[PDB]
Design a binder for this molecule. Structure first.
Ligand SMILES: O=C(O)c1cccc(C(=O)O)n1
Ligand SMILES: O=C(O)c1cccc(C(=O)O)n1
Ligand SMILES: O=C(O)c1cccc(C(=O)O)n1
Ligand SMILES: O=C(O)c1cccc(C(=O)O)n1
Lengths: 265, 265, 265, 265
C-alpha cells in the first residue's frame, strides 16, 4: 500500500535529500514535517521549509502524529531527541526510521523491547548508504576466507578526523570474524614514521585527504596469488538515498527493532 | 581428524599446485595419485610424477581406493572421466571433489542422488578461486539493490575467447536476481562499432587483452550518487588453492552433492 | 600584473564556473561580460546575468573591447561565433582564449597568422580539464615505450555518444606515436558480439554508462610483467577550471596561437 | 648495427632475466658473462652458469674486455664493484650500463668526466622498470599543476622496509617541483595513530603489505572537482626488462654519462 511518511529535520543537508527522495518515490507520500528554526535565523539567509498544503509543518511530534497519522516517521534530527521521538512513535503505531545515533544502552533497550511487544518495525541506520553498508557486510563475510586485509579511505581535505567513522565501523565489523593478528613481516620497520598506517585489531587503516575527493573506501583482501577488493565511491548525498528508500519500505515489513542496515540487507 | 587425500591428474598446471597445497596443509596428507602418461611422452621432456613411498602412483582408481582408502579424491582429470570417477568414489565411501566440468544433466542427477542416499559429501567446483567466487556471489546479492551493472574482465593477450568464462558465469549469476533490462540512454548510438561492449541479458561486458595481465575482473554497480565495485585480481594458479583447501575441508562436513562453491561459501 | 578578463557567455554551465574561477583568482579581475538572452526567456526561469557596476554586460564585442580594453577575452560562446570573436580580439590587442571548437581550417589559419604577425597570444582549448589533457599528453609519451594499450571511459547513463570525445582524442594522440597494430591474439573470437570493444587504429576502446558516474577515463598500457595506468576522474565542472586559469595566465606570456592545451602544458 | 652485450652477474634474479632478455632481443647478442661463485656453493644447489661456446664465462673483466670486445657491459653485480667496472669499461671503449647503486659522489664524478672526455655513453639505472620510471617522471611534471598529492605503495608481506625505495624516490622527484607544504586540514587530528601515513616534505605516503601482492604504486593528484592518478603494477622481474633493453639501445646513441632513466626516457 502507499506509505505515508513524515520527516523530522527536513532542512538539513541529509533532510533536503530525503525530502526529494520521498517525494519522488512512487509508493511514498510526504505528508508532514517536524521542523523548527533558530530564533535568530534571518529568513533571507535561512529560509523556512516551503509552505504547502500537502506537507504541513509541525513543531511538536505528538501533534503531528495525532493529526496526520503517518505510517513512518523518518528522524533526521539530533542525538539528544531520537529517544523521545522513537518512544513516542512506537506507542502510537508509527514506525520510526532513525538516521542518527544517540541512544544510550538503556534507551535502546527500552525502544527494542517496546517495538517487540507492539510488533512494530523500527530501523536505526547510522549509515544509510547501501553501497557503503554492503561493502562492510561483504567484508565481514570475506574475512572468513581472507584474514589478511587493509582498509584505505579517502575524503576531501576539510575532514577533521582520521580515520573515518566508516573505516572504524568497517574494521569493527571485520574484527567480529577475522582472528586477531597483526600483519606485515614481524621484523619490518618504518623508516618514515607512519608509513604503515593505523591499526585496529591488527588491521591497517590508511587515510587519504585531497581536494576533489568526496568519500571513498577500498578494502583489500590479500591471499596467495590474488587480491580481492571491495570499493565504494560516494559523489554526493544522493548516495544515502537508496538506504532511506529501503529503510522506509522494509520497516513496514518487520515487527521488531533493527540496529544497522547490515542486519537487514 | 587428518584428511587423507588422493589427487587425480597431479602433473597438470592446476594439479601441480594442488599437490603442493595438499602437501603444505597441516591437516591433510597426500596419500596417492591417479596418473598416467601419453605413450609418446619422452621422460626428458615430460617427467613421471616423482617416485616416493609416501605417494604411490595408481593407473586405476578402483585399485587406488581399495588399497589406500583415501578420505577424499580430488579429481583434476578431464570432462570425459569425471562421471565414472565420481560414481566410483561415492559407492566406496570416498568423498569426491571434482575440479572440472563435464557431467551430463543425467550424470549429475545420478551422482546427486547417490550422494544423498549414501549421506556422503561431494563438491563439484568449476572455479576454485575463492576470490572469484565471492566476487560472483556478492555481485548477485548486490544486484538486488543496484540493478545497473557492468562487468570489465581483463586477461593476457594470448586468450582466445571473449568474454571470459568467469564473466559469462558472473552475468548468469547476476541475471538470476537482477530484473532484465538494458542500460544506457535509449537513444545512445555507437559511432565506433563495439564501444558499448557485449550484452548478456542487458548487462554490458567488456574484455581487455594485454601483455602483462593474468586474470582480472571488476564488477561496477552504479546508483544515484555512488559506485560500488567488486574486483578480483589473480596473479598465478595459487589463486585457486584456497578453494581446493576449503573444498577438501568442507566436503567432509556435508552429506550431499554441492555444485559450485558459491553454494557453500 | 593583474589580468583584466572579459567572459563571453557567462550564463552557460561552463560560463558560470568560469565566472566564479576568474572572480576568485587573486591575480585576475572580471571586468565585463559579453551576453544576451533568447527573446522568449522569461526572467523567472532564465535570469539575467546579475547586475553590477564592476561587471558590465555588453551585447557587442567591439563595444566591450573599446570601452573596457580587457587584457583577455575568454570565449565560451558557440562554434558559429568564435572566428569573428577571435579576429576582432587579435586586431585590438586583446588575447583571446577560446573554449569551444568551430573554426574552419581556413579560419584557423587566418587567426594563427594574425596572432603571429601581431605577436599576441591566443589559446584554443577544446578541453580545459588539465587532468584530462595531461592524461592524454602523457599517454602519447608512454606509447613510445608501451605500444599495447586500451582505453576505458566511463560516463553517466544519459550520454548519447559512445565512445566519448575524450576517448577519441586520446586514441588520436596515441596513434601519432604508436605504430599501427591490432591487439589480442590473432585467432581470438568474440562469442558475445562486442566484448572486445571498439577499435581506433587498433586501439581498443570500451564505454561504460552508469548512473552515479560523471566523467572518467583510464588508459591501460600493458607490457611484460607489468601494467602502467593513467586515470582521470571528474566529479563536476570545476574540473575544467585549472585549465581556464592556466590558459588566462599563459596566454599573456606567449606570442602566437596555440591549439590544444597539450601543446603548452 | 648489432649490439654485442656482456653481462656481469648472470645468475642473480635480475641477471637471469637480463640474460633471457638480451638473448631474445633481435638486435642484441650475448657474447660473454662476468661470473664467479662462492667457494662453498655445491653445484647441486647453486649451479654454474650453463656452459656454452657462444657465451664464455670470465672471472676478470679486463680479460673479458680484451678477449671479447663487447659493445656494452651490463653490470648487475654489487655496489662495491661498480666503480672499478665502470672505469675499466670507459677506458676501453665499452659502454657500461650499471644496474645497481654504489658510487660515491667522487666516484660518480670521475666516471662522468671520463665518459664526457671519451665521448662514450654510460647509463646508471637504479630502477630499470620503465613503467615505474615513467610514473615518477610524469608525477614530477604533473606536480606543477596539481600540488596536492599522495602516494600509496603496496608490496608483499615479506618486505622489511616501509616506505619503499620507489616511494621515497617518487616523493624526492615530486618535491623538486612541488612547493613544500603540508596537506589535510590544519586542525585534523588522528584518533588512531598513523592513519594519515608518513610524510616526505608534506607528501603523505602509505604502505600496504599483503600476501598476493608483488610491487605496486599509485600516485593520486587532487584538485577541484577531479582526481588524476598514475599507477604502476609489477607482477614479476620481467617488468625490468624493457628498461634493460632501452638502456642497452640508448647507451650506444649518447656520448656522456646519464644517471637515472628519468633523465633519458
Ligand atoms: O565515515 C565518515 O566519517 C564520513 C562519511 C561521509 C562523509 C564524511 C565527511 O565528509 O567527513 N565522513
Ligand atoms: O574465466 C576464464 O575464462 C579464465 C580464467 C582464468 C584464466 C583464463 C585464461 O587464461 O584464459 N581464463
Ligand atoms: O569526452 C566527452 O565526450 C565528455 C566529457 C565530459 C562530459 C561528457 C558528457 O557528460 O557527455 N562528455
Ligand atoms: O621500491 C622498492 O623498494 C621495491 C621495488 C620492487 C620490489 C621490492 C621488494 O620486493 O621489496 N621493493
Amino acid at each position: 500500500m502507499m506509505i505515508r511518511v513524515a520527516i523530522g529535520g527536513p532542512r538539513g543537508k541529509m533532510g533536503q535529500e530525503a525530502v526529494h527522495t520521498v517525494m519522488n518515490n512512487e509508493n511514498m507520500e510526504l505528508v508532514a514535517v517536524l521542523d523548527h528554526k533558530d530564533i535568530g535565523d534571518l529568513l533571507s539567509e535561512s529560509p523556512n521549509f516551503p509552505a504547502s498544503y500537502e506537507v504541513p509543518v509541525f513543531l511538536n511530534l505528538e501533534s503531528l502524529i495525532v493529526t496526520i497519522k503517518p505510517d513512518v516517521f523518518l528522524d533526521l534530527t539530533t542525538p539528544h531527541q531520537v529517544f523521545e521521538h522513537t518512544m513516542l512513535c512506537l506507542q502510537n503505531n508509527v514506525r520510526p526510521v532513525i538516521g542518527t545515533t544517540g541512544f544510550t544502552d538503556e534507551q535502546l533497550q527500552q525502544c527494542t523491547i517496546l517495538a517487540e511487544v507492539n510488533k512494530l518495525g523500527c530501523i536505526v541506520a547510522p549509515n544509510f548508504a547501501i553501497g557503503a553498508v554492503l561493502m562492510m557486510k561483504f567484508a565481514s563475510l570475506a574475512a572468513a576466507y581472507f584474514p589478511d586485509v587493509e582498509i584505505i579511505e579517502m575524503h576531501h581535505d576539510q575532514k577533521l578526523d582520521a580515520p573515518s567513522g566508516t573505516a572504524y565501523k568497517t574494521a569493527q565489523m571485520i574484527a567480529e570474524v577475522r582472528p586477531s593478528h597483526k600483519q606485515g613481516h614481524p621484523n619490518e620497520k618504518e623508516t618514515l614514521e607512519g608509513a604503515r598506517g593505523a591499526s585496529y585489531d591488527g588491521i591497517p587503516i590508511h587515510s587519504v585527504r585531497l581536494p576533489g575527493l568526496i568519500a571513498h573506501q577500498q578494502i583489500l583482501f590479500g591471499g596467495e596469488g590474488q587480491l580481492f577488493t571491495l570499493r565504494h565511491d560516494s559523489y554526493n548525498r544522493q548516495s544515502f538515498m537508496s538506504g532511506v528508500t529501503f529503510s522506509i519500505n522494509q520497516v513496514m515489513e518487520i515487527k521488531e527493532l533493527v540496529y544497522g542496515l547490515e542486519n537487514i540487507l
